[PDB]
Design an enzyme around this catalytic site. Sequence first.
Site, PDB file in Angstrom:
ATOM      1  N   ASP A  49       2.920 -53.640 -18.156  1.00 33.60           N
ATOM      2  CA  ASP A  49       3.326 -52.473 -17.388  1.00 33.60           C
ATOM      3  C   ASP A  49       4.842 -52.585 -17.107  1.00 33.60           C
ATOM      4  OD1 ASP A  49       3.084 -50.047 -16.044  1.00 33.60           O
ATOM      5  OD2 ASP A  49       1.933 -50.904 -14.357  1.00 33.60           O
ATOM      6  N   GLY A  76       3.474 -44.703  -5.182  1.00 32.51           N
ATOM      7  CA  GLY A  76       4.756 -44.089  -4.906  1.00 32.51           C
ATOM      8  C   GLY A  76       5.837 -45.133  -5.095  1.00 32.51           C
TER       9      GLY A  76
END
Lengths: 242, 242, 242, 242
Positions: free
Chosen positions: C91, C192
């Site tokens: 990732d 977020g």
Amino acid sequence: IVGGQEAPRSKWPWQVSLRVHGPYWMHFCGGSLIHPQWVLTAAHCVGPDVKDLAALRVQLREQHLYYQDQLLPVSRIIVHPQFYTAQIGADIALLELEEPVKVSSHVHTVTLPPASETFPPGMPCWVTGWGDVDNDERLPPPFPLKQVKVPIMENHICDAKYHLGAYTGDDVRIVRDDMLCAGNTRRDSCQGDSGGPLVCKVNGTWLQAGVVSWGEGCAQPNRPGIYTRVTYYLDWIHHYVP
Amino acid sequence: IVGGQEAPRSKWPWQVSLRVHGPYWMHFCGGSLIHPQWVLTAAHCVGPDVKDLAALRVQLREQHLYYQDQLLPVSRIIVHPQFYTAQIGADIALLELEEPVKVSSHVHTVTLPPASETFPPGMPCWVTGWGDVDNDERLPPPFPLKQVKVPIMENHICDAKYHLGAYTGDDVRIVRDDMLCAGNTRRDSCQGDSGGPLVCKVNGTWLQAGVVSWGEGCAQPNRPGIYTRVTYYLDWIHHYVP
Amino acid sequence: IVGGQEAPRSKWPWQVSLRVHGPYWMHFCGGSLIHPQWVLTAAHCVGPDVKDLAALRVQLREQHLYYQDQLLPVSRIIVHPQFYTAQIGADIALLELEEPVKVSSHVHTVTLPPASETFPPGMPCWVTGWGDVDNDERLPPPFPLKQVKVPIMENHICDAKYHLGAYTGDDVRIVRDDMLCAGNTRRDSCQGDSGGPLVCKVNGTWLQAGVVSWGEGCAQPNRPGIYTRVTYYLDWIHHYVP
Amino acid sequence: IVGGQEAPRSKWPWQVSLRVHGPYWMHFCGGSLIHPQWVLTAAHCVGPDVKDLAALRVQLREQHLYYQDQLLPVSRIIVHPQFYTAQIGADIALLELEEPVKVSSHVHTVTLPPASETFPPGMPCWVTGWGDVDNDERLPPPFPLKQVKVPIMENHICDAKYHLGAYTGDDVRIVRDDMLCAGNTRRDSCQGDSGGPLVCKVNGTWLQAGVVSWGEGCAQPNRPGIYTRVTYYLDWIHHYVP
Ligand SMILES: NCc1cccc(C2CCN(C(=O)c3cncc(CCc4ccccc4)c3)CC2)c1
Ligand SMILES: NCc1cccc(C2CCN(C(=O)c3cncc(CCc4ccccc4)c3)CC2)c1
Ligand SMILES: NCc1cccc(C2CCN(C(=O)c3cncc(CCc4ccccc4)c3)CC2)c1
Ligand SMILES: NCc1cccc(C2CCN(C(=O)c3cncc(CCc4ccccc4)c3)CC2)c1
């Protein structure tokens, strides 16, 4: 505000924002400073059920919501006794600030119209606030104060328009005498704008004609926005504010 | 329906469900067969804005919603002209079925009351329907018809109860003469039950005393459910129903 | 960011906000300036499916989101090829700005660590971002950059915690080798904050130890936040950033 | 189930519904009866975190969900130790019913394939369940069991299709060896169907080729449904199931 544009930092010094306590101090309605110590708002914003004074805050003009917060406490919430819902009427209320406001070139009161003002079609009028930009459409961040010039429509005409497409009898009033209409399908008030002002420029001076109240949606065909007619409640307003 | 229980297959042969066209034929309000060809309902279920007959269907007494539908077309939707909102009143309507229902033992009309019947506190009455089992709590599948017994309360007391915890003037009527109150904090009608029946057994006969209409929440303290008083509109009803 | 506090204006000069166009250029993930012309973020923020470059923009160190935006275009989106989901690994992604940032004292690049760097427990590490303050709790307006000091945990002790209350075999690795763990039930990154930086002060120097990736909820019992180990992907990064 | 139609009553005797406890025994995933006392399902329906057995119920074949329930308790939940997420693999699980099922014509077991079965490119296979009829579109009531025929896609051909328009490297497989593809842009399984069977008729005998497991959306361009390859987990299954 549906339509319009962001207000210049120099316009609408009397505008305020009502805040309820929760995850953060969230804006739920607008209002206006009509006296160093009194904010004029809509009764449905704070009623009909009695609310907790400690859970409410008043925020004065701000170009961008939440960015320059200086929350003010309120000692009294005065709701018009005739109020239950905005369709029935009397959607008006007062917030006496715990402390008076030191006026400014940027922040000062708004003038209430004389008891004979009517505001006919054609007058330059603007409604302002931080409410939705369209049905179910939130004002995106940074939340600029918006404004929009809206047309005033005669009451009896607006009433007849509300009866358009409805089952209601032509002789049963929808838009009442203590109400006022303004806006079209491109310029309107909307959720979150409630309690704020509709002001018109009369004889070189801004007069608050109404208080954002209700309507069938926002900017929909044949459904102008409805405002609480200020003139109809001066007697009441004056019982409390000097 | 808040509280109460699923209804025995042999009880309430007059209950009906109103369906709107969509992904499927969704239940949106209750109703009651009062004549082989007429359904009595609440105006707010089909108004005040006129809608298209084609989007509406009527389902007769079913034990489990959607289970075995037999939708019936409607030829006329008749809304009382004095209606605009439930708080204002005149929340009553009539639906004319394209065809008269074949009454049986499992499905038949409910009796309308005589203009003099007041239904005072102490009368045995039941509200039936497929609405929410609590504020924002849907009737879970398989969506059975529920029933709940509710205590009636005189209008004047109910009206004053609604002023408890409110800013509304004590002399301003909230609950009106064309309405009837019933229920408590543990037994009530709720969203989706609207337009359905409130029946009281009067000297051997179940009579429809009210139409489920509105209230502040469901089973909320000092806020019994408010129903349209059927006797008040008997004149209006008979002008259409034989 | 769960826990912690709003970050002073001087700290975290490398923090950047990623933006997708919609009603407004909404923030969706964190990122960090690692070179005047390259931002390091999480592959999941911009992948694995290919997205329109005209739909993305970058914002450098901003104290309060939306407040004073200076949106930057992007030329290239480079995603590690072995990336499909964050649980699988890799990732990590790279964003090439259309042109180099006029590096300043307030906003400038962060330093990548050596391949030998390990960043062991008890180290002084911090995570920064504009993500949710709790599970399903958005950072309230006016959205200030938040920061929180988190305790690093050994990869194997972390893997053990992740097996507590789970069916997955003890011998089956949940916290993979190209990953890093930090946080507790009081301090943690959250939705977020993805793509944002985890920095550790090593012998007088701030080094980026990881990039916010995933975890089970935020600040949940036995579920430390998981980061992409930067040391693992240096050759890939250096292969693009000068 | 996307596309397709309701299943005739005689078909799919092995289909089952898994229920979770809440306001009502809510359906959350499909499943299949492979032994009078064992149900085959996807591990993501009941894992990775360990679930409360008292909160789980099994419902054998039903034409309409919830209309004639007969919930059976589970005594054991066996999640494959290799399971963590459906993209990683091993998305398979076993539920052991408290009591052996009284097998019949209306409801009996499904046949598992021999260790070498392959199911070639484009075969008459069917998937069934009570899931969404489309992305974000629920099965409306009365929730009839749906069925839809779907073409098989060889894994290599499928894996390539998942790489189209995606960053992931061509040499990095997304569709794994213990997975299988079926479906297209008009026929597919969907959320709610997970755990249910994919059956292919080979030589008169219906064999379960897979377990509904995952995919990118439902019936999306270049993204066929992905199922757990049963043959790949036969040994593990028979270690528990006679
Ligand atoms: N543009 C003016 C304006 C300004 C601020 C807030 C609103 C909102 C009031 C609530 N609202 C209704 O539509 C509404 C709510 N309750 C009652 C009615 C009247 C009756 C009615 C009900 C349903 C359909 C048609 C008519 C209307 C949305 C807009 C409207
Ligand atoms: N329990 C009987 C019953 C039966 C069917 C439907 C309802 C529903 C009506 C709408 N509703 C309101 O709260 C409601 C909506 N609009 C207006 C009012 C009156 C004014 C009001 C508004 C807000 C707070 C207090 C009082 C009340 C939910 C229950 C209630
Ligand atoms: N606090 C660290 C942190 C930082 C940034 C973002 C997240 C979010 C990642 C997504 N997320 C999941 O729970 C999650 C999503 N998809 C998959 C898994 C793993 C499998 C799983 C699923 C459900 C329960 C247990 C385990 C977990 C919420 C927190 C978490
Ligand atoms: N039609 C097959 C099928 C059957 C049952 C359930 C699902 C659902 C799985 C979850 N889901 C995702 O889109 C999904 C969720 N998490 C991860 C991924 C893979 C990675 C990914 C994520 C976002 C975009 C592209 C690729 C995909 C919805 C359909 C799909």
